[PDB]
Ligand SMILES: NC(=O)c1ccc[n+]([C@@H]2O[C@H](COP(=O)([O-])OP(=O)(O)OC[C@H]3O[C@@H](n4cnc5c(N)ncnc54)[C@H](O)[C@@H]3O)[C@@H](O)[C@H]2O)c1
């Protein structure tokens with residue numbers, strides 16, 4: 001197929017690009033390098049099945065771009081990703097995550113795109129639900145502008161599906177980690193620990209360390225994107241996680257084990273959600289998707305990546 | 311109370327201003343005149359409890375405005391309201407209805423505002439619901455960009471409620487009609503029909519006239535805004551309607567009967583985004599708020615016709 005990936009210069013985006021190319025697709029990458037990195041895509045310099053477009057989804061002529069490249073599927077991973085930044089500037093977050101998505105859908109419905117695969121946020125859209133692991137049927141209850149914008153994006157895409165029959169599905173990842181993750185933000189805690197411990201710099205667990213997340217390896221997430229790109233799961237969100245809860249403290253230990261040396265983090269005052277754990281049954285039933293990579297193994301893979309960057 | 315009403319130059323907005331003033335409140339109106347009119351407010355030139363601010367919610371310094379006026383409640387009625395334009399330009403619609411709401415909430419949480427009363431869209435947010443009349447517990451399933459932005463608005467306000475304790479409630483009216491409604495607008499059919507038939511000009515329905523809406527008089531809607539402004543219904547939406555369905559065709563007949571003359575609308579192609587049926591369950595507003603609509607359609611239609619006769 002012809003694929004276009006927004007946020008292609010990013011962690012998950014560049015990984016998806018690699019997978020799509022490996023599957024024999026042509027891939028157009030799109031990014032404004034808000035948080036992305038040229039080094040994430042540099043290996044594709046002489047790959048003729050890949051084309052890169054520098055564009056800001058907020059202001060670029062997405063109509064002209066999609067008219068030119070005629071993607072069959074648009075994989076939408078471009079977003080303002082930082083929860084804290086979304087609180088400091090909800091307008092900016094909403095412009096990128098809501099307006100950006102709307103502009104893309106409006107362009108795609110006019111240019112013969114079959115499907116948009118949106119990226120939601122499994123870790124934040126549910127707020128604090130009464131069910132863990134959390135199924136997609138649980139009500140959204142966003143507690144940050146970031147989370148609200150992700151929900152709004154889902155809803156707008158569902159709307160375009162009604163209006164025009166532009167298909168859509170929402171990939172809602174838990175806590176994604178792995179090679180290429182930027183050691184920054186509360187998202188990149190695996191990267192932060194790996195880089196710091198490898199350096200022998202201090203590491204900080206914010207709170208008593210009991211807070212839990214659902215850690216899913218980037219390759220598993222990418223495979224979900226590929227699966228859902230088909231004519232399946234229309235207008236549906238898919239939780240993409242492992243359905244296992246790992247405490248902040250336990251995560252440190254897993255990274256410490258991989259790195260070697262001391263497992264002795266600093267404990268800081270609490271900064272946020274106490275638990276996150278996704279029910280991944282729908283993805284199995286509908287897409288045949290299961291995560292392949294368990295935490296200890298994934299962390300070793302991730303630490304291996306950071307070893308060579310250090 | 312110190313109130314601020316966005317969309318104050320508009321149809322429902324100017325009516326709400328009047329009601330709040332009558333109840334003895336201090337009122338700041340705010341509007342950019344996108345679809346509103348200075349003439350909707352001109353009777354307030356010498357009203358000493360009202361001040362007007364010309365401002366765009368998308369671009370103005372709302373922080374500064376709220377900092378000055380310190381409203382306790384913000385009644386948020388400013389919006390792009392045309393479904394057809396929302397289809398033609400979903401970006402602009404989202405800018406006014408989502409970004410505008412976000413900017414207001416961000417300003418409000420910093421300026422000691424107690425509560426924002428949002429205006430959702432009872433008519434459109436449910437899309438095609440599982441049952442009629444439709445309760446608030448029915449899932450949202452917007453089928454136009456306009457409807458999507460309203461849903462998105464509710465969600466962001468709920469979020470700010472969680473984040474900051476900036477209280478909110480969502481008034482979700484059905485088909486609002488009455489004096490001051492734009493007679494050249496999109497779907498304000500009472501106003502469109504009243505003005506046109508009074509003038510002996512053509513009238514149109516979009517589709518085969520069978521589509522139903524739930525027609526609720528502006529004065530009743532405004533009452534709901536006032537009730538909900540207190541410490542009640544935090545985080546909740548309230549359907550504001552009558553729970554009675556009137557077809558486009560029946561609506562036209564009602565107006566023509568009041569006006570006199572022919573009852574013969576043109577049938578045009580249906581509009582992208584329009585729903586077949588709309589009818590709100592208003593049980594929650596009745597129990598929680600004590601709200602009930604007083605004005606029946608025939609009565610309201612007469613009140614509207616007379617407004618357009620003399621204007
Ligand atoms: N990493 C996680 O744990 C996680 C989990 C759930 C959701 N997500 C979502 O996955 C997607 C990918 O995030 P990531 O972890 O790879 O982070 P990332 O920052 O590496 O990727 C986001 C990319 O989007 C680009 N981008 C941002 N604003 C843009 C704009 N206006 N125009 C064009 N490109 C723009 C950035 O430059 C960057 O390359 C995002 O939508 C994010 O919200 C990530």
Ligand SMILES: NC(=O)c1ccc[n+]([C@@H]2O[C@H](COP(=O)([O-])OP(=O)(O)OC[C@H]3O[C@@H](n4cnc5c(N)ncnc54)[C@H](O)[C@@H]3O)[C@@H](O)[C@H]2O)c1
Nearest residue numbers: 317319320321322342343344345346366367388389429486
């Ligand atoms: N009339 C109905 O049947 C109905 C039904 C349900 C919901 N609503 C909602 O009720 C509210 C009032 O609508 P109405 O029927 O009075 O229509 P209206 O057009 O008369 O009122 C909307 C007002 O908002 C103002 N406005 C628009 N964009 C603005 C911006 N960027 N900055 C500042 N002001 C801006 C307009 O100039 C206008 O005065 C809207 O939120 C609408 O979506 C109306």
